[PDB]
Ligand binder design. Structure first.
Ligand SMILES: C/C(=C\COP(=O)(O)OP(=O)(O)O)CO
Ligand SMILES: C/C(=C\COP(=O)(O)OP(=O)(O)O)CO
Ligand code: SF4
Ligand code: SF4
Lengths: 401, 401
């Protein structure tokens, strides 16, 4: 189902229909703070952020970028950097060529280029710089910063229709048009199709789906997909997954970013985890072993089952660094931990390896299945440690080099 | 887009294409423990569980059900109860008619009815009881308990094809067929279309989408949609949202349950919250005011912004019980809290009411927008309390009776 697109290299990372969907994120430290920003780029990259964006908002930020890059490279960290430009990107790129060169990609927002005639000139200057330096660009529209002149143009087109659409629908048309027009203008200037990524983000899931279907149809470019301003906590996580899944399953989207608001003191790597979970849930990429477990019900003892499931999950997380190094393919491992005989054996047979605890009315023994067939039956104390040993033995055999 | 279906009443709650998608859940206490189970049904219902399921696994459980029901009614709690039957449902329903009568719905699993010839007789007996008592039934297939005789029949049909499908695909065909055959058999027995709900659950998102598309096509019934055995934590939440969204946006699904494994000590109401968030994220139902907020970046001061967003979210949660009582429609309230001028004003204008903090390079003032236009501009200490007062004033005006 994957939409074909040209490949756009962002540093060493290829983006497009022929490549895995790349996970990205954005820093939240002040870019002028070289120490804090370098540390957080490294943190995000180590969590799985294949590309990292940072705001390049003012001259102090611009002056910091080459140093951040130098420090990354000194540790052998090859993480591509995307500069986020608004209002003054043309001035910062012009004035600070070492910043322009140190970035791996420029983001432009067609709605933050300035007013009237100035918008076209500013756009052209940034595209010129990118062309001169061989850099890729994302043309990223966002409905929080929609070009007002385009909105009026589309509102007038709407008003001439025999059956005008709602104001909200016209906003979405304008957002798509903003990105498409800017894409076509960049191509016309001579920027290559191997240098252009597009996005057009809204904060409501159902709207996002509409928008990206239009962008996918109307353009050839790789698409950067995300639900902007998703918010805090569970709501942010749910909204992000809900918005992305329909599109991802239809084959639309080449890189994703999850726009979560961190709780105070929550690490900025949560968004990377959520991004990875979305792709893995959909069978698009595999990052780490996963545990399938039942909710538990009145058929099982709640504490014991919940404790075991949690213990298995924690052990897999502990073993992963080593495993990733020794056992190619282990990222695909599926482990089941189940509460009773109703679905326990069947679900366990669908995992690589799984355990079915005894629930109410059952003899106190726990079958273990691997590769769809009975492996052993556990009893007594120490079920969890025995099971984890069996998972280790399984991994070493199944994912051996 | 909503798929039309007959209405099935579960107690007082209507399920079907003409009705809101109902949120449901399942208890995890031992059903024999009347006190614990009654308490948890009440807890789940107060969190938003419009229907509550409990396992009816053995005779002690069956004997408890009428008492649970009596205690609910004594508090004026009209929450419909679904009994979850496996292996011995026909015996429990037969032997305990007061249990049969106290339930509002029976769940049958076509894969947990017994072996061979026994399966048909057991199925018929449960359907007979439901018919006698006027109860609705869910015929709920699950791939953890797939009828093995049907699987073999479909594996043989597959093997005759010019291009056989994979074993995994045949499992999914068998699961659909299990539910469809049982549905058709119940209808043929005389159970009404106003008494039959269907489900056919798997634990992988992309598979769920395939299954439910087939069930929706092949049947007329309302559908109970959920991703079974979704697991723990963020993974469970993401997988559930990812699996449900594509279907919900295509108009498929009449009731949902989110199958999360609670962490030890985590309340069983988390699944209800997640269910509600899925429906609200998709614009299908509204349960509570929501906060749209940016991720924050290097343009904003991280702590202050994150703290404000969290404070606003917490206050809305605190005010909701009162608000729900005074201000019809308040569940639809959208509040924005934004980090800087880039997207702050624009996003805030899309909310009912929103605040745009000042970010880097800006004067220290925070515009507030309501109904898409500037309401005021805040400065100094106490921005959060001033803003919350403005949100209160807004609510009282906008959602007045
Ligand atoms: C930093 C920012 C918005 C918040 O990030 P998002 O990643 O949500 O959206 P976008 O940047 O438009 O791709 C600027 O539009
Ligand atoms: C209790 C149980 C499974 C876990 O609940 P689920 O709600 O995940 O699945 P189902 O019951 O099949 O609707 C029995 O199949
Ligand atoms: S496997 Fe058993 S304990 Fe777990 S939710 Fe299913 S029926 Fe309940
Ligand atoms: S509104 Fe401003 S502070 Fe918030 S993420 Fe967007 S650009 Fe950064």
């Amino acid at each position: 189902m994957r939409r074909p697109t040209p490949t756009v290299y962002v540093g060493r990372v290829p983006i497009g229909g022929a490549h895995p969907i790349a996970v990205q994120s954005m820093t939240n430290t002040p870019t002028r703070d070289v120490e804090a920003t370098t540390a957080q780029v490294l943190e995000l990259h180590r969590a799985g952020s294949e590309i990292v964006r940072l705001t390049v908002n003012d001259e102090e930020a611009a002056k910091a970028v080459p140093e951040i890059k130098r420090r990354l490279l000194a540790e052998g960290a090859e993480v591509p950097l995307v500069g986020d430009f608004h209002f003054n990107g043309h001035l910062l790129l012009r004035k600070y060529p070492k910043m322009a060169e140190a970035l791996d990609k420029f983001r432009i927002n067609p709605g933050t280029l300035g007013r009237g005639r100035h918008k076209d000139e500013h756009f052209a200057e940034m595209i010129r710089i990118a062309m001169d330096l061989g850099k890729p660009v994302r043309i990223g529209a966002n409905w929080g910063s929609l070009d007002p002149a385009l909105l009026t143009e589309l509102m007038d087109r709407n008003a001439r229709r025999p059956e005008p659409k709602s104001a909200h629908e016209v906003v979405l048309e304008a957002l798509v048009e903003s990105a498409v027009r800017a894409y076509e203008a960049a191509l016309e200037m001579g920027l290559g199709e191997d240098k252009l990524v597009l996005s057009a983000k809204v904060s409501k899931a159902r709207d996002l789906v509409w928008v990206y279907r239009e962008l996918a149809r109307r353009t050839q470019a790789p698409l950067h997909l995300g639900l902007t301003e998703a918010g805090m906590g569970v709501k942010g996580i749910v909204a992000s997954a809900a918005a992305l899944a329909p599109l991802l399953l239809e084959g639309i989207g080449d890189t994703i970013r999850v726009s979560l608001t961190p709780a105070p003191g929550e690490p900025r790597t949560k968004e990377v985890e959520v991004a990875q979970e979305i792709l893995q849930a959909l069978g698009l990429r595999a990052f780490a072993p996963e545990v399938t477990s039942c909710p538990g019900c009145g058929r099982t003892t709640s504490t014991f089952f919940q404790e075991l499931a949690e213990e298995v999950s924690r052990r897999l997380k502990e073993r992963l660094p080593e495993w990733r190094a020794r056992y190619p393919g282990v990222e695909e491992l599926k482990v089941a931990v189940m509460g009773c005989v109703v679905n326990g054996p069947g679900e366990s047979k669908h995992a690589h390896i799984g355990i079915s605890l005894p629930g109410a009315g059952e003899e106190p023994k726990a079958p273990v299945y691997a590769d769809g067939k009975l492996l052993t039956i556990l009893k007594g104390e120490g079920i969890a440690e025995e099971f984890l040993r069996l998972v280790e033995d399984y991994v070493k055999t199944r994912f051996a080099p």
